[PDB]
Amino acid sequence: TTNVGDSTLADLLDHSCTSGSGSGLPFLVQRTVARQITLLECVGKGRYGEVWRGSWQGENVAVKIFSSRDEKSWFRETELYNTVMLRHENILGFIASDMTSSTQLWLITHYHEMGSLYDYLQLTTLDTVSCLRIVLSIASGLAHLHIEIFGTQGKPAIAHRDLKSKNILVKKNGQCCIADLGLAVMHRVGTKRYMAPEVLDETIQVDCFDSYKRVDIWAFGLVLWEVARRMVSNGIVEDYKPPFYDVVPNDPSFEDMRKVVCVDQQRPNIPNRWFSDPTLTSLAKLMKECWYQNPSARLTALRIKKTLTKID
Amino acid sequence: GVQVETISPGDGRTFPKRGQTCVVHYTGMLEDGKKFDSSRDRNKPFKFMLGKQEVIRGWEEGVAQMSVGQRAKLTISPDYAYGATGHPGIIPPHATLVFDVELLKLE
Numbered sequence: 001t002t003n004v005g006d007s008t009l010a011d012l013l014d015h016s017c018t019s020g021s022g023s024g025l026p027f028l029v030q031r032t033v034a035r036q037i038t039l040l041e042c043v044g045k046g047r048y049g050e051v052w053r054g055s056w057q058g059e060n061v062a063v064k065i066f067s068s069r070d071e072k073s074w075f076r077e078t079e080l081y082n083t084v085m086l087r088h089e090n091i092l093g094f095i096a097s098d099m100t101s102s103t104q105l106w107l108i109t110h111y112h113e114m115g116s117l118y119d120y121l122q123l124t125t126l127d128t129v130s131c132l133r134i135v136l137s138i139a140s141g142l143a144h145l146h147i148e149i150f151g152t153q154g155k156p157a158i159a160h161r162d163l164k165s166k167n168i169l170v171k172k173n174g175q176c177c178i179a180d181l182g183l184a185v186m187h188r189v190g191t192k193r194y195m196a197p198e199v200l201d202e203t204i205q206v207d208c209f210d211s212y213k214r215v216d217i218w219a220f221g222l223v224l225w226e227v228a229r230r231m232v233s234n235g236i237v238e239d240y241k242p243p244f245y246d247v248v249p250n251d252p253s254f255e256d257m258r259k260v261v262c263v264d265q266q267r268p269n270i271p272n273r274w275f276s277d278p279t280l281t282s283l284a285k286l287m288k289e290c291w292y293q294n295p296s297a298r299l300t301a302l303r304i305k306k307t308l309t310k311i312d
Numbered sequence: 313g314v315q316v317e318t319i320s321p322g323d324g325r326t327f328p329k330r331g332q333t334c335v336v337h338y339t340g341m342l343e344d345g346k347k348f349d350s351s352r353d354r355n356k357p358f359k360f361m362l363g364k365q366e367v368i369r370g371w372e373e374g375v376a377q378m379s380v381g382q383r384a385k386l387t388i389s390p391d392y393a394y395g396a397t398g399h400p401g402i403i404p405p406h407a408t409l410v411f412d413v414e415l416l417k418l419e
């Protein structure tokens with residue numbers, strides 16, 4: 001029940017920047033809000049645990065309740081958001097983390113009722129404007145993760161390491177935001193389907209931060225392909241498929257992927273109908289420059305954002 | 313568990329009970345004095361209801377031992393704070409915490 005002085009989450013999130021004070025609510029407030037949330041309905045579930053829609057004082061929140069198998073993701077995700085000021089409109093907005101009590105680990109964030117891009121693409125087709133808006137916003141979120149910013153207001157470079165359409169949410173305004181920083185590195189292993197060749201054949205230069213950024217870029221190219229399939233041109237559109245759907249089984253093994261990507265050197269196929277639309281011709285070219293076997297040759301996140309901004 | 317060092321008296325008569333909202337100002341620090349949070353830095357009083365487990369156990373016992381107006385320094389051992397786990401990237405594992413707390417008002 002409401003009293004004079006109460007704040008909404010927007011107010012609580014806003015008065016929260018003294019350098020070192022984190023992306024979410026004030027550190028002592030996180031627990032109190034966590035324990036005042038009513039959980040309502042389960043909206044996702046997987047090897048990571050479950051996401052619930054909850055409410056706090058009349059507002060929707062998402063609560064991720066981690067499975068015991070994936071506690072290190074809770075710790076790392078919570079540490080990243082508490083240590084760093086990571087606030088961007090294309091990165092999922094962190095609110096609070098809490099452990100209860102034989103023990104539940106919670107990460108509470110903004111709730112996106114449209115759900116994941118993965119589900120979004122299965123339930124709808126896209127036009128030029130909405131396709132570009134989706135892939136640009138992902139590019140922007142990812143460029144922001146990758147960029148080091150200095151000063152009292154700043155953040156280190158961050159690589160994600162498990163970019164996939166299931167870890168992208170759709171906002172009501174039709175832009176997306178990247179979620180799930182449980183594997184992120186600052187300057188469990190990735191989902192196998194989206195692993196870059198250097199991860200699959202373990203030649204990744206594991207002490208060069210740029211290696212991890214280039215792993216993100218590979219995955220980002222796969223997501224573009226997923227998204228571009230669903231843009232209609234001349235009445236034609238491809239059915240939603242995940243990357244490598246035709247050459248690896250569901251839940252592919254590390255070995256299945258390595259054979260396809262590294263030994264046989266396969267890449268997702270570019271539909272020929274795309275070459276008669278200028279935006280998909282451009283997205284086609286963007287994709288291919290994310291999929292060089294030489295990780296150094298791949299486009300940066302800032303360049304993709306720049307290139308996508310010009311297609312318009 | 314939790315030590316209460318009075319820095320300035322309250323009324324010595326109005327102590328919070330079950331179902332009361334305590335309105336406080338706080339500055340939380342690590343054992344060596346490093347500030348990790350303060351409601352004074354943002355000039356927004358913090359509120360919690362006693363007997364709902366909304367706060368770490370040390371805060372709940374410690375503030376229950378204070379009377380309105382009182383400022384006191386709470387030294388809270390990890391079993392009554394964030395335990396083995398801490399709070400990643402802010403409170404380390406096995407942290408003793410010192411909170412400077414003023415009981416402004418009950419509601």
Ligand SMILES: c1cc(-c2cnn3cc(-c4ccc(OCCN5CCCCC5)cc4)cnc23)ccn1
Pocket residue numbers: 041042043044051062063064107109110111112113114115116169179180
């Ligand atoms: C990762 C993701 C999230 C997250 C934030 N918002 N959010 C929203 C969803 C979401 C997923 C699916 C949704 O579908 C809505 C309709 N379905 C219908 C069938 C079952 C109930 C809901 C709605 C919302 C999933 N995850 C999140 C939070 C933390 N980590």
